[PDB]
Design a protein around this nucleic acid. Structure first.
Ligand code: ZN
Length: 250
DNA sequence: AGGTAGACCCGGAC
DNA sequence: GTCCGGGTCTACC
């Protein structure tokens, strides 16, 4: 899921787990657990803790317990469900938090690609994976000035810049391509080549792309641009498949 | 050290 | 049967 859908998950999941107490943690694929390094320590430490809150930082969910925070990333295909311990698990379930009321929070992922870290709550923001994360794109902390100051000092393309999680939280390949289209800027342009006007327009369209979230360019190669009718093109930029309108973007 | 490459994962596309 | 697609971290120069 993208940032908007993670926010929806955050809002939906919270009432389904708040106030529940962890009785067991069952791990079927240890490598999902990134901290502590031993999945057995990860499981052991969570037992007896009650879920108190659920926050979002970029595409990360931060589960707040009594002492610890669980930081979880679903990437593209991960899913959470709350369901009864009496019922069979869904296929591809890798980690289950069992609660004392006989319900469970389950993480499943056909791609097995997600990650989980647990630290004392007070340490979570200064450790991976949250430590270097840039500002929320819908927050005043993400501004044209912030974007401009990062763009000026780099040799990288504008696409590589917007994909950098330290610049802004939660912009992945789809919203990067779409925002750049909406701003009229080619993804391969050096970040340092953008004028003040272009930086300001790009900020505006990034906020709009995220705020709104239905595609102009992503995956639309060889089909007509919805604004000018020119066929959408696809190339590699910053090591990613990159979609753009060669007329609308400059 | 700024910035790219490696690593993780595997359904489905070639 | 080999490889893309996806995000975000660690490992290099
Ligand atoms: Zn166009």
């Amino acid at each position: 899921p993208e940032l908007p859908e993670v926010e929806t998950i955050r809002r939906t999941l919270l009432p389904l787990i708040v106030g529940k107490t962890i009785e067991d943690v069952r791990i079927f694929w240890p490598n999902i657990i990134r901290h502590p390094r031993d999945s057995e320590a990860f499981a052991a430490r969570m037992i007896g803790q009650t879920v108190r809150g659920l926050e979002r930082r970029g595409k990360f969910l931060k589960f707040l317990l009594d002492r610890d925070a669980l930081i979880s990333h679903l990437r593209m295909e991960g899913r959470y469900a709350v369901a009864s311990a009496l019922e069979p698990l869904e296929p591809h379930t890798h980690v289950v938090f069992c609660f004392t009321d006989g319900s469970e929070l389950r993480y499943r992922d056909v791609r097995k690609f997600g990650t989980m870290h647990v630290y004392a709550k007070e340490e979570a923001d200064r450790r991976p994976p949250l430590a270097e994360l840039g500002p929320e794109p819908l927050s005043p902390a993400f501004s044209p000035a912030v974007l401009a100051e990062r763009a000026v000092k780099t040799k990288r393309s504008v696409k590589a810049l917007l994909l950098d999680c330290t610049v802004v939280a939660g912009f992945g390949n789809i919203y990067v391509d779409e925002s750049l289209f909406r701003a009229g800027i080619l993804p391969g342009r050096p970040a340092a080549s953008l004028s003040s006007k272009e930086i300001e327009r790009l900020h505006e369209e990034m906020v709009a792309t995220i705020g709104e979230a239905h595609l102009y360019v992503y995956g639309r190669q060889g089909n007509p641009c919805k604004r000018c009718g020119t066929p959408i093109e696809k190339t590699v930029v910053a090591g990613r498949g990159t979609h753009y309108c060669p007329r609308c973007q400059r």
